[PDB]
């Protein structure tokens, strides 16, 4: 299977530098173009740069020329984006993609994308509070419970339930930027009322920018 | 540069319908236009390349066509899982450029929300902030009004909402509203009420608790 | 300034779709009529009723 995997995105101060990698497998980047494409509210999907690793030819968007360089190491089947003199408008999800693979004249494979946050604020790990199921979160024989993941920066966090074995009825909400400048999100799951107390329910929270990994058990509050 | 102009910005249709979205190139791009689908938390996925050709694995209900500089994407029998953002892209001149996107939403029958409320956790109350969470589960359409009342006084400026994207199976939404107080304020008042107005409800639903009750 | 023109797409068989066009009032208007004419190719001649100073449109297709 063809696969591209970006890494290296994170929080970087204005004026600072960051280097992203794009690791390819299931094909050889010598046979295709490799592109970097970013996505942001300001510009939507926005082409950044491309390279033809067979001969080293590169091209850049005007807004990044001189501040970004693309390159590839065919020995490691990997492409790179060096990002210097970073600005607020560089904050974006950075994807890499291939073009021309198997003769397809389009971007037929993309990575999952790596997030770059250009900001002067500093990293902060979330507090993870349970949303305990109760008489006020149940009806029709089902009950809602969850986890509040409060006061983190930067994005992203990930939330799973019972190590990913619980997916049905899960709603993990989009984060909200609080006026403090810190993010917050909640994740809820709906389950049979009769399972409360016999089935263990744990939200697995990971905030990699602060090395924060939390497994919070959510149970009915006793009185 | 070549700009790609997509319309409409939002299109909402029933399951089984035929939907058409369009993309206009500011100058001749020949057939060098691709269409991508982007679903929640995913990267763009190639649907159509060179204006009219189905990428491998893509369902045959997707089709594309070209007339001069006008490019259309058609979904002949809309499925719930086609809920997504769609983007066209030209590769005829560098820089390759993308349209601004068309969002496709599924129309379905009205469903009133399940309304739940969560006091601040005892853990959170240990430090100095209180978060009260109101949950509207699995409703349609998206429009809803959540109002917070604290001891019957309408709250304003101290709540934030978040809405999930349309469910890929039942096409419903869920919504959370979070009211944020100081702990001192939270311990000062008694009745915490979330009031939900929604088309599926015969009249607004209030869900509430008294601070300190079990 | 930016406005949203809301449009009901009313097809001959009774099926209804809704769509939004955004931009300046003049851009959003032109896009709506352009889109109406495109769908008319396969759905039959259209007619467009305008409510609310033109910020909302009902567009029926003849089939």
């Amino acid at each position: 299977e063809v696969q591209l995997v970006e890494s290296g995105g994170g929080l970087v101060q204005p004026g600072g530098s960051l280097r992203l990698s794009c690791a390819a497998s299931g094909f050889n980047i010598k046979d295709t173009y490799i592109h970097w494409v970013r996505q942001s509210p300001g510009k939507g999907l926005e082409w950044v740069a491309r390279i033809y690793p067979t001969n080293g030819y590169t091209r850049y968007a005007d807004s990044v020329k001189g501040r970004f360089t693309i390159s590839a190491d065919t020995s490691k089947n990997t492409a790179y984006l060096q990002m210097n003199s970073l600005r607020a408008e560089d904050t974006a999800i950075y994807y890499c993609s291939r073009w021309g693979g198997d003769g397809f004249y389009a971007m037929d494979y993309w990575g999952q994308g790596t997030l770059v946050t250009v900001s002067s604020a500093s990293t902060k790990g979330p507090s993870v509070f349970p949303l305990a199921p109760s008489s006020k979160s149940t009806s029709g024989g089902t009950a809602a419970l969850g986890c509040l993941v409060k006061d983190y920066f930067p994005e992203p966090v990930t939330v799973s339930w019972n190590s990913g074995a619980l997916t049905s009825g899960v709603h993990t909400f989009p984060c909200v930027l609080q006026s403090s400048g810190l993010y917050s999100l909640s994740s809820v799951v709906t389950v049979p009322s009769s399972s409360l107390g016999t089935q263990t329910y744990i939200c697995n929270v990971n905030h990699k920018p602060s090395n924060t990994k939390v497994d919070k058990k959510v149970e009915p509050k006793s009185c | 540069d070549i700009q790609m102009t997509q319309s409409p910005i939002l299109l909402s249709a029933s399951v089984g319908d035929r939907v058409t979205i369009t993309c206009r190139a500011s100058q001749d791009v020949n057939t060098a236009v691709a269409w991508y689908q982007q679903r929640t938390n995913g990267s763009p996925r190639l649907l159509i390349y060179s204006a009219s050709f189905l990428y491998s694995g893509v369902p045959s209900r997707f089709s594309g066509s070209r007339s001069g500089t006008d490019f259309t994407l058609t979904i002949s029998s809309l499925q719930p899982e086609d809920e997504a953002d769609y983007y066209c892209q030209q590769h005829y001149t560098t820089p390759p450029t993308f349209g601004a996107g068309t969002k496709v939403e599924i129309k379905r029958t009205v469903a009133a929300p399940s309304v739940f409320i969560f006091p601040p956790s005892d853990e959170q109350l240990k430090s100095g902030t209180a978060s009260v969470v109101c949950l509207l589960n699995n409703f349609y359409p998206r429009e809803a009004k959540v109002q917070w009342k604290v001891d019957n006084a309408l709250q304003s400026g101290n709540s934030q909402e978040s809405v999930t994207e349309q469910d890929s199976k039942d096409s419903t939404y869920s919504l959370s509203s979070t009211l944020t107080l100081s702990k001192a304020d939270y311990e000062k008042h008694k009745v915490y009420a979330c009031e939900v107005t929604h088309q599926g409800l015969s009249s607004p639903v209030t869900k509430s608790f008294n601070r300190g009750e079990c | 300034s930016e406005v949203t023109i809301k449009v009901n797409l009313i097809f001959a068989d009774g099926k209804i779709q809704t769509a939004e066009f955004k931009g300046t009032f003049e851009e959003a208007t032109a896009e709506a009529y352009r889109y109406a004419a495109l769908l008319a190719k396969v759905n039959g001649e259209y007619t467009a009723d305008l409510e609310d100073g033109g910020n909302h449109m009902n567009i029926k297709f003849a089939g």
Partner: peptide, 12 residues
């Protein structure tokens, strides 16, 4: 309508 970082979708 523009892309939203938190929803990872075009807003509406």
């Amino acid at each position: 309508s523009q892309f939203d970082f938190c929803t990872r979708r075009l807003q509406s």
